[PDB]
Write a protein that binds this ligand. Structure first.
Ligand SMILES: *[C@@H]1O[C@H](CO)[C@@H](O)[C@H](O)[C@H]1NC(C)=O
Ligand SMILES: *[C@@H]1O[C@H](CO)[C@@H](O)[C@H](O)[C@H]1NC(C)=O
Ligand SMILES: *[C@@H]1O[C@H](CO)[C@@H](O)[C@H](O)[C@H]1NC(C)=O
Ligand SMILES: *[C@@H]1O[C@H](CO)[C@@H](O)[C@H](O)[C@H]1NC(C)=O
Lengths: 209, 204, 209, 204
């Protein structure tokens, strides 16, 4: 069970279902004006839309998203209208490193894979800020589980995660390249870190340390 | 029968109720009645809510300091009845909606309280939502919980939802002594499944 | 089963044990400079020391207490050094009404039963302040429900409780007499009230109509 | 055996470990060693604590940004070793106490680090306390739980407590490659019961 870096803490999603997902509980509020989020992934199968991590309040279920689709990756911020698609990036069955970015001052969006720029644009959700007090999850969208499940079966994820880090400010180009190193496990953000901030798996999600 | 009434002894971040109607809830004109004996009322106190993923305020009936507010379609649509709630004693809250011209009217204790027109005219209530009692739709799972100030504090009974507008004769008949055997076409008291959670308990 | 007032929510403590107690979760902080408590009780048996409600931080387990002892009732605030005892107030098997009081400005202490003053004194815990962030419980000491931590058996309580209200200021003499009425449980305090503030029974403690 | 170990993947508000020693914990002179590989170090992160109802700080070993602090008796008594903790690497923390004259010394990696005298002389550690790992003493079901900042974040192994002050020869022998089958006379690794809670889990 090799892992990208010295990390020995990787969540495992055996098989998609309507009750499999992970939760995150940031210590500090999620009010963001410009955020950078990176995450490793070893996807097993990709459907029309597979969620890796998603943030959404009660009145807006797509405040933030980053999902795969066949051979493309999509980054959604602010709402369902905004998007950014990189083509022919992810290969099934191999580890890879994904990283986004955003800036509310000018609405500039970016997306990196394996430390090399893939797709970028400008004027995305300009003049917008993500409200605090929402709900964050990894591998699933924002849906209830108190009664009758609710998580659509096709949107779940199956594979491995690690190094899930969310900053709260724009990063540097060199730094985004560094986190993909072979011994970069000891680099963490200030909003959510790996192995520090609470992450509670549910419904079969299990650590594979 | 008139032998049961859900109890809400406290307000917290985990207390709520859930309902599981059988038939699809997508309706054009309906009517919902309920019995409320509120122990204490804040600015907002939900009795029964309804919302989808993209809409949390499809149907609501939330209390105020002294007024009952009926919301259909969304937040921006409101209807307020001023001074007909009294803590510590039973009362009959029930509202009526008609989508043909957005006609709306709120029936309290068997007497018309307020009425308006052109409220969500033509809007169709979608299905696939979650129908709760005493708590607004919010995070079901362990992700915090519902907003504390919204939860209910008291007892409830006789939750009914009809599939068609009700005549002025029908509403009065539901407020009678023996009305408890009357049940709604979509949701019926003592028939539809109810699962109190997080402290709330039945009372016989 | 008759109840003192028109209320219909009385907690039941069937039999004492090492895992029977009630918890309270005040909405607002417990930092108190002068507090007035209150409680209805129908005790079944009284041991050397039976607790009704107790508040204690991590570094001090006896910030506030009110326990029975045979025919006497004790009120402890600040620590074991402070105390106040009435002689023969309590009678087993019948409902009764108990109230406390305290003032940090001078240290005046009082205690009422059924609206008639029983014992009163001054100069205890003078110039004292109760720190916030503690743990509050009804009917048991502050030991810990945690595995490996068990409440001492003899200190538990068995009977009925209702109208548990904790104010945050000294009351009026007439008001203290009012709450003992036969239809007066519709008046409640602010720090804790009966029927609004969370009260979670544990280990067999059960609500009753 | 040293194959196993405890894991603390996150410093939440409910994560801790508990220990249940067999013999009474009332001791006059003792010695405790443990293996720590801290993922992240804060102003104060408890490794293993011990306290009674009146006394919550009978024995403790809490880390600082670069220092390790040994406490016996309460807050007023302390002992600090400055700059001998490295994140991401194994290290061997262990200390000794002698109540006859309050003689204390802290052994790190098998070499003396700091020493003092009159460290709470004559005081007798009482029994009846609660012995935890990675978290301070406090309620878990009521009042939320423990204090978040105190909780640990990393892995631990080889928790041992002895019943007599060790000699300079014994301490080094515990740091050897084959040392891991050695166990203390009060709490031994891999024999004493351990019940991780709130997300903690073993690792093999
Ligand atoms: C995937 O989603 C796109 C969204 O535009 C849709 O056009 C396409 O038909 C979908 N394919 C499926 C569900 O197989
Ligand atoms: C509830 O009512 C007022 C308006 O009537 C609202 O603005 C506020 O949120 C609540 N009032 C208070 C005093 O909190
Ligand atoms: C309570 O404690 C003693 C034993 O410690 C017990 O025998 C007696 O009933 C009570 N004595 C006093 C002084 O309260
Ligand atoms: C860390 O703790 C020391 C006391 O040991 C204190 O002086 C200092 O301000 C603390 N720093 C932070 C960042 O909490």
């Amino acid at each position: 069970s090799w892992l990208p870096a010295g990390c020995e803490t990787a969540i495992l999603f055996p098989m998609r279902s309507k009750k499999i997902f992970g939760s995150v509980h940031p210590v500090r509020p999620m009010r963001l004006e410009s955020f950078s989020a990176c995450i490793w992934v070893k996807a097993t199968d990709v459907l029309n839309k597979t969620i890796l991590f998603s943030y959404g309040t009660k009145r807006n279920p797509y405040e933030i998203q980053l999902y795969l689709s066949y051979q493309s990756i999509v980054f959604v911020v602010g709402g369902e209208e905004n998007k950014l698609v990189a083509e022919a990036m992810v290969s099934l069955g191999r580890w890879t490193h994904l990283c986004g970015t955003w800036n509310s001052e000018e609405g500039l969006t970016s997306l990196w894979v394996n430390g090399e720029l893939a797709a970028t644009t400008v004027e995305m959700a300009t003049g917008h800020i993500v409200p605090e007090g929402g709900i964050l999850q990894i591998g699933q969208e924002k849906n209830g589980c108190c009664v009758g499940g609710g998580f659509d079966e096709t949107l779940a994820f199956s594979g491995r995660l690690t190094g899930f880090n969310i900053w709260d400010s724009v990063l540097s180009n060199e730094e985004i390249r560094e986190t993909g190193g072979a011994e970069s496990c000891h680099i963490r953000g200030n909003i959510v870190g790996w192995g520090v901030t609470e992450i509670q798996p549910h419904g079969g999600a299990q650590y594979v340390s």
